[PDB]
Design an enzyme around this catalytic site. Structure first.
Site, PDB file in Angstrom:
ATOM      1  N   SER A  69      80.908  17.127 -43.053  1.00  0.00           N
ATOM      2  CA  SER A  69      81.652  18.449 -43.579  1.00  0.00           C
ATOM      3  C   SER A  69      80.844  18.825 -45.063  1.00  0.00           C
ATOM      4  CB  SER A  69      83.227  18.452 -43.670  1.00  0.00           C
ATOM      5  OG  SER A  69      83.760  19.641 -44.278  1.00  0.00           O
ATOM      6  N   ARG A  70      80.076  19.817 -45.024  1.00  0.00           N
ATOM      7  CA  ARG A  70      79.375  20.263 -46.259  1.00  0.00           C
ATOM      8  C   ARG A  70      80.372  20.549 -47.366  1.00  0.00           C
ATOM      9  NH1 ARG A  70      75.305  22.261 -47.588  1.00  0.00           N
ATOM     10  NH2 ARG A  70      73.243  21.542 -47.212  1.00  0.00           N
ATOM     11  N   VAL A  71      81.666  21.298 -46.842  1.00  0.00           N
ATOM     12  CA  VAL A  71      82.527  21.788 -47.610  1.00  0.00           C
ATOM     13  C   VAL A  71      83.095  20.744 -48.684  1.00  0.00           C
ATOM     14  CG1 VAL A  71      85.090  22.699 -47.896  1.00  0.00           C
ATOM     15  CG2 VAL A  71      83.241  23.779 -46.359  1.00  0.00           C
TER      16      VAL A  71
END
Lengths: 50, 130, 166, 146
Positions: free
Chosen positions: D117-119
């Site tokens: 999850s890049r977030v």
């Protein structure tokens, strides 16, 4: 495609082989380190055996 | 034509009819044989672009309704044993159960040569089965 | 009195009195939530006073909507509002909000939540109201006397093979 | 509609593969220049303009949000396909399901190594954030030892 997946599964099998060989390497290295102490304790038992 | 027969037996009568097909892949192959002549560019692997819709219409027609029920069993040919082919890939989504066969399993003398790992079924839930 | 700039430096409207009045005039606190949404759309970020007014509207409202809604909880709604205010807006709740929460807990009869809110008020605010504490204690004692201290199936004894796992 | 009105939506797609197939069919019937796998060059733009509409609006714009959960199928773990590559590059992270784990019993069959999850942790709750801060390292150590 078919040939692409052939090569891919060949690569996966080779990677599995590498991992297994790494595990046995670790096992044998642990055993070797355990047994290496014999060097400091040998060469003084077979004195009169000579 | 056979599907129309089954549809009549399902609706106008109200039966639980069996429908065996061997083999569906020939339908897509035949349509691809004429796609270019009709004047439609090849899409992928040589198959016609309209493969998805053409197969989906027939698969949807092959279904159980309120009036009657149809139990369909279709043989599917996987060229070169390459499951990634677009026709089988599309067919996967229009089925309740799939039985995948393996040439290696057949060579090992096991018959039927069935790969349970790749096999699947919708009713494999505790609510339906024991 | 002082301008407040948004994330990108643009100013915002600090005049929230009309929206507070609308919230106080609402009937169901879902309408107050809608008013907060409208404020956010109009670039009038809610303030502590607005959140406290929303909590008061929740406490004084009959229900979530005109029609009943299953498993609705004023306490849960107010706690969600408090989380939104503190975390996603960087605003510390005041003693008024906690007092409203304790009042709602007492009115509902949730003595355990009343105890928890009392502890929270003692920790952060300057203690919990004696009247609310006494009301919570009275409700707890009434439940204990009537036999509703804890659920029934929990008190029920079940062996290893007796638990009827559905 | 809800996002611009200060509310939160969750759009699920099942699935973009068939949408891409349909667009390819339409283009080829209409005699448009194809490309890799015969998908025209506008497939990437199509998916990008479909997904970029999911966003977290600023507080002054309403505060609403849209969450996108597109679904993609890979044939024999062929993640190098054109559509899969495009969508992975577009999205803000992926959740990878593994047939091996699914058969082995891990249901869901998420493969943490292939899932990201890049977030990051900014989207986790405070308690969940604190727990995950240690859980992630614990799982990493367990994988390393296994």
């Amino acid at each position: 495609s078919g040939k692409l997946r052939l090569y891919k599964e060949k690569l996966e099998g080779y990677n599995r082989f590498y991992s297994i060989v790494k595990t046995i390497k670790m096992v044998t290295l642990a055993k070797y380190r355990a047994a290496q102490g014999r060097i400091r304790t040998r060469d003084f038992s077979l004195r009169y055996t000579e | 034509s056979a599907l129309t027969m089954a549809e009549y037996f399902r609706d106008v009568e109200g039966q639980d009819v069996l429908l065996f097909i061997d083999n569906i892949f020939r339908f897509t192959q035949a349509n691809s044989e004429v796609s270019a002549l009709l004047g439609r560019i090849p899409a992928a692997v040589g198959y016609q672009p309209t493969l998805a819709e053409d197969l989906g219409q027939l698969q949807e027609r092959i279904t159980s309704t309120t009036k009657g029920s149809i139990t369909s069993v279709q043989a599917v040919y996987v060229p070169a044993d390459d499951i990634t082919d677009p026709a089988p890939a599309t067919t996967f989504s229009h089925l309740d159960a799939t039985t995948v066969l393996d040439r290696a399993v057949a060579e090992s003398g096991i018959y039927p040569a069935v790969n349970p790992l790749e096999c699947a079924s919708r009713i494999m839930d505790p609510d339906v089965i024991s | 009195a002082a301008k407040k700039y948004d994330l990108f430096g643009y100013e915002v409207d600090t005049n929230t009195a009309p929206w507070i009045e609308k919230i106080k005039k609402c009937k169901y606190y879902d309408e107050a939530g809608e008013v907060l949404v409208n404020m956010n759309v109009s670039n009038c970020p809610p303030d502590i006073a607005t959140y406290n007014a929303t909590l008061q509207c929740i406490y004084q409202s009959p229900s979530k909507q005109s029609t009943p809604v299953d498993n609705e909880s004023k306490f849960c709604a107010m706690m969600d509002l408090l989380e939104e205010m503190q975390h996603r807006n960087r605003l510390k709740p005041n003693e008024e909000s906690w007092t409203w929460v304790m009042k709602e807990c007492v009115k509902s009869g949730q003595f355990r939540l009343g105890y928890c809110i009392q502890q929270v008020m003692e920790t952060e605010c300057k203690g919990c109201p004696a009247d609310l504490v006494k009301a919570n204690e009275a409700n707890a004692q009434k439940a204990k006397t009537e036999g509703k201290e804890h659920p029934g199936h929990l008190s029920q004894q079940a062996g290893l093979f007796d638990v009827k796992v559905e | 509609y809800f996002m611009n009105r200060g509310r939160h939506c969750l759009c699920v797609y099942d699935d973009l593969s068939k949408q891409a197939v349909a667009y390819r069919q339409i283009s080829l019937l209409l005699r448009r220049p194809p490309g890799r796998e015969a998908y025209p060059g506008d497939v990437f733009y199509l998916h990008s303009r479909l997904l970029e509409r999911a966003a977290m609006l600023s507080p002054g714009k309403g505060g609403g949000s849209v969450t996108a959960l597109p679904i993609v199928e890979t044939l024999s773990n062929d993640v190098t396909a054109y559509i899969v590559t495009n969508v992975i590059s577009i999205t803000d992270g992926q959740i990878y399901l593994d047939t091996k784990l699914f058969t082995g019993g891990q249901r869901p069959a998420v493969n943490i190594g292939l899932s990201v999850s890049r977030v990051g942790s900014s989207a986790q709750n405070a308690a969940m954030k604190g727990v995950a801060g240690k859980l992630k390292g614990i799982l990493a150590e367990y994988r390393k030892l296994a």
